[model samples]
Target chain A: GTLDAPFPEYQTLPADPMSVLHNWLERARRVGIREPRALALATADSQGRPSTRIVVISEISDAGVVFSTHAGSQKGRELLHNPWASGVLYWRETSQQIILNGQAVRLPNAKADDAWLKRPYATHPMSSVSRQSEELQDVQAMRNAARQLAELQGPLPRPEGYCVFELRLESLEFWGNGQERLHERLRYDRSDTGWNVRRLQP
Target chain B: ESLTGTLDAPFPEYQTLPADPMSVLHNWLERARRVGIREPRALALATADSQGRPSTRIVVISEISDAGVVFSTHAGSQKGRELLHNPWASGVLYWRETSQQIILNGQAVRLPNAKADDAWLKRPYATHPMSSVSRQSEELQDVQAMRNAARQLAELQGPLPRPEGYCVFELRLESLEFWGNGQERLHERLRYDRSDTGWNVRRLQP
Candidate 1:
């Protein structure tokens, strides 16, 4: 067996999946997983073609995982059309992974604006100049536009395309890597009664 | 100002993007492997279920071939079943160590059984024991029993055979995007989408 700390003992059925996920997230930060909040967010177009890329998790609420992006971005457009998303966080240092899949709901304007205003001033320029996922005709021209936007003194308004989304999770899976390749997976599925947890074969 | 890279290396401009995404991908993969990042070939593969519900998981890239990026897993596993049912798949290779990412979206097609065996045979013998006993993504009632089963199988055969349901699949490229995080969040996003003749290249705003 490969040498490492033993996998943490976890309940096959946790009463609260959200709390469990939060605890794991805290542990990952304390243990020094680089970019621990960075996750692979998956979304599919109307035609069911799936795509995934890294996105920084903004918050984890009782409702679901929250993240932000440009409304015109490919992911944003797809989520608008399909309303489903999945997020995966893999920590190689501890050989642990978390997978969450569920419906995605766009945040209301007030919440989106609040989140946008909290972002650093440096990031605003990119949002102002870049219509994300669109072809870049002139790199230099875009840079100039961003530089000009950054120079303005007043509070820069959030771009109309800026949006926030929360993926209201219907299912979540926690995977612990085993030394002998007998990994442990505990899955939680929502039901009318409550969340049903089960152990899956690895 | 340079980006906040602990490595102190500025974001190298992707100045030489080619019309063929494969060339850029090859270069990036080679660079990542050469930089000595552990498991640099690992990628997050996303696949939609029959109902269009998407899920993502990590898988190791076995090869970068003319057909596409190749990988192997159990045919009965969740990802395998999903890909079998829905051929469209996407993968993201993010190298935090290098502050870079490669995103690939494409169609998946299964390779022949013989090719799967070839890939399986290449794995170290210690790994074969796990493949011999455990079905990937299946429910495990007892860990010790699984290990015992593997030991028995390993002892019975001098050269272990490939697992019964092992499979290899390739993602045929339709599009690939390369992202480089730059100073002041002026990230560079270059994409190449395949056309009938070749590929159409474009620079995308990050």
Candidate 2:
């Protein structure tokens, strides 16, 4: 283990967990952490089979963390079956981890369309295919489809299956690396009035 | 706006997916090894508790079997108990240097007790003895408690018997997916879903 002597100290954070998240995120960006917004999003099917993958968080707002995905994707399908999801964003450089648990809600159609429109033109070819998680026999066929889609002159329409979703935060936990295996953990849970914070054993 | 130039190569396409996942997995593992990052075998393992709530934690992969992957832990650990209650698991392997990610999901089956014993035997005395004493997921009062326990266990275990509650498990993959990033959100994703006869290949929108 590459232990840094005199491990960084943990101090009191602001009242809002989102504020802390924003601060850490900004620091990550400043430190040049490649793809700092990337996080592991975990979701479970109705039958309780769990699945997880990396997703870039496009927005962090009062509502929660927002990301867009193909509605027909495995994660999208799983969210449809079960609204609850968990996300973990670990910064390897800093040895910090943020764990979030929440319920996923689909964004309104108008907003979804706006987000879809903002995507780069190169992405339209893949989005136009609209057959996420489906079989593709060969790359040549896929390339031909992409070329045909690219040749169209008019503005490309957003696929109905593409939508934006937000993870409505129910709980957020912050873990900071401490000396040895004894890390520092702090958690905030949503109550009726506001958030309730507490320290937890690592 | 349209791309000024096309993305570079090494992006996965449908034709790039191999008939068998083991070889492709071997290649990725080889590359990850060559990249030589700390904790190259470490991956995020996701599992659902009995209540169906999803949880994830890091674990070191000890072996990659033909059918799946292997890792060892105490049966009483949080992940261990979760896998026991629900055998399905999903793991993500991300290599920062290579910018490669592989997601594998499948059923977990416990290996024989002999394998667990063998794994314990192979562990270094300095390292395994420490973990051999501490219980995973158990709340520790303070750092001192862990150090004290480790010291006492090291002093007592001269014979170095296999620790109790140790177990090895393997994830029998039902599906494996490979993802490669491209410029401007034009990443490539190829998934292989297992079937009774063999595997079915698919290309997913990125």
Candidate 3:
């Protein structure tokens, strides 16, 4: 049955593919997949020199992926500098993949702050750390800074470093690799009217 | 446009890595360096901003040490701001041709001045003054502004005014996973366990 305009071929993917991807992610976490929440975030500058970063996956939504960080971060600046970007979530253990390409805009800071408090306190040391993506002279100095901030701020002071944002998905692709050769691919794309989804050969 | 799963079970084999993970990373880096990989350290660095915008950047992998990963930036850089706002970070290294990738998601900590200074000194002279190019992510009138700034840097050599402006950080690599795309449709997954004796390696499902 040849579908009409509503069912675009390339952009659309099956719903089950997404489900399978989600399952892979959840299982990967249990097996201690390194930075299971990490995603290959792709962005570009004014010159189209596409840049990428490994960003934490704050959460997942039917609409898109969620994450958080400082607006002043290098990648944050690039996003603010250029909103168009794409992100890829690759799970090695499961041989599954989820890629989201879309616009990255800022979310309300106040709401994100509340989410900050709920995060594990074990992560506080990191929040206190400074000079990410930069060079330094002494490793102990930074460690000391983190220690000082942690002491001064208390166990759960909730530093300003905690940030949060959701990736409003414009396009999503799901890939699942089978044991032998039966790999599956599903994608969803936003169209002029609504979402179009379909499956792909793999 | 899709592989019909025809090729006999795909299993890509890597020259079994030398025992030390560090050695493997160094060897890979040397090869990548010579090739002048456009984005050497261009891993996806993810963070949430004040507005909760999940931002990311592709930074240059300027330096590496026995401890962790290193990169440089301005204090006001968006990524820097995010780190200041939220220190935790995740990084991914992907090489398409080799189909070799390494992903590290762990706690990021700033290095001390001494450590940063050592790296700074190692940088080419032209890049030294770059550390002083303050107020990044801000409006710029013209290219001359940087030219002028670089000129100013030439006059004062060795740690210019406000040395604190430049920053260096390391991702101590709490967790590292290696991936390889193979032929049999079965991918290779290996993880290094961080411990007192060093990494504990293990294999997993494709």
Candidate 4:
């Protein structure tokens, strides 16, 4: 349950999958789950080599799970050649997780700027100095660059290629830890009409 | 990302990446366990389908063998069939309690069938065998009937053998990354890539 408590048992899953997803996310935070917004994002390269990492989700709504990453990073580079992505948000203690997979859409510069503007002051320095996924040349040099950048008084500029992406949902699967190894799976497939859900064998 | 780990000299040792990253990875796992993290071995695994799309789900890290990370699943499950189709996978194990993560990308190698039976019995849960009746990803018809039938099988035949299709597999690792939580996301990222000579090490920007 992304509301204030655990997801209650229901005769049938709710109509809106997003609500359930958001509710689980909300409940995760409410229950004191650490890094509740972090998602394991997966993206495959042209050669079909799948790669995944932890990325903080900036936003979540009907628009799809929102996250920002460097356009030149491994994930970003892979997305350029293949626009699809898959992600899972898990709360281990709660034994709940949500998996979302679909096409990834790169957002406009304005959206990227918005993401940067809302950032906490401490992050701006690293966001500006880090090359993201590139091999390090001089560690002290990077520190100096970021330290100097952090002292600036005016609004720090967003990294030129830092982009925000929307993992536009085509399908969302809700999972619950069941007794035994028979985990509960409720998969919701979205279409033009709406969502069609099926109980997947555990 | 803990980029400042090396750059800013907070965790300076991060720059001295070991020749064998697995040693450090094993150390990290032990540290997480000592620190008392829940399910420290849990990882989020990703596999690709024929359409070049990727999907992710949480699975336990059964073992970290010289071959690679190990896990087991119903051979007929969504992830199992996907591996049968592509044979490659990528996954991440994160411990928020310790602010550490390990990401590995590799190809799958199904272990011998003889291991299948043992894998089922070795599962942490006593009731894990009940899931055998309902295969992992089959579309459900009657929920009540399904559970009822599964119970009958479990109650009637108390000690269960591994489902014929339950299988064990190891991911033959190619690349592995160790991440440390850094201030404001300039985290430290160290990667070990398999080279013809040996494992190659490098530090990537957070």
Which one is best on DockQ? 4
The backbone clash count of each candidate, in order, is: 2, 0, 62, 12
- Give the 10-residue window scoring lowest on summed lDDT in candidate 2 chain B: B1-10
Full candidate order by DockQ, most accurate first? 4, 1, 2, 3
* Per-residue accuracy of model 1 over A1-202 as CA lDDT, tens digit each: 1223234545335688898889888877676677777789999998889988888888998877999899999999899889988888887777788999999999898998998888876788878888998888888888888899888873589889899989899999888876567678888889998788777767
Instruction: Place model 3 in a CAPRI quality band.
Output: incorrect
Off by over 4 Å in 1: A1-6, B1-4, B8-13, B156-158
DockQ for every model comes to 0.62, 0.39, 0.03, 0.63
**What ranges in model 2 sit over 4 Å off?**
A1-15, A148-155, A192-202, B1-17, B35-40, B121-134, B147-166, B182-187
Backbone clash pairs for candidate 1 read A201-B138, A201-B139
Per-residue lDDT tens digits for candidate 3, residues B97-206, read 35556666555677787876776767765445644653554433343455566667777656544356467878666556566554322345555557787766555432
Candidate 1 local lDDT, residue B136: 80
Q: Assess the local accuracy of residue A95 in candidate 4 as a C-alpha lDDT between 0 and 100.
A: 76
The superposed Cα distance between candidate 2 and the true structure at residue B43, in angstroms, equals 1.7
Highest lDDT, which number? Answer: 1
DockQ of 1: 0.62
**Segments in model 4 whose C-alpha atoms lie over 4 Å from true places:** A1-5, A179-181, B1-13, B156-158, B183-185
Local distance difference test, each candidate: 0.82, 0.75, 0.57, 0.80
Residue-level lDDT of model 1, residues B33-119, one tens digit each, is 677765777788999998898988889899998968999989899898999999999999877776788899999999998898899
Candidate 2 lDDT, A1-202, residue by residue in tens: 2322222223454578888878777777776665667678889988899898977798898967999888888899999879888888776666777888888999999988898878876678767764665555454567667778887763588888988999999988777765444466667789998887765544
- Which regions of candidate 3 deviate over 4 angstroms? A1-35, A152-161, A178-182, B1-24, B27-91, B94-206
Model 2 error, position B29 (Å) = 1.1
Ranking by lDDT: 1, 4, 2, 3
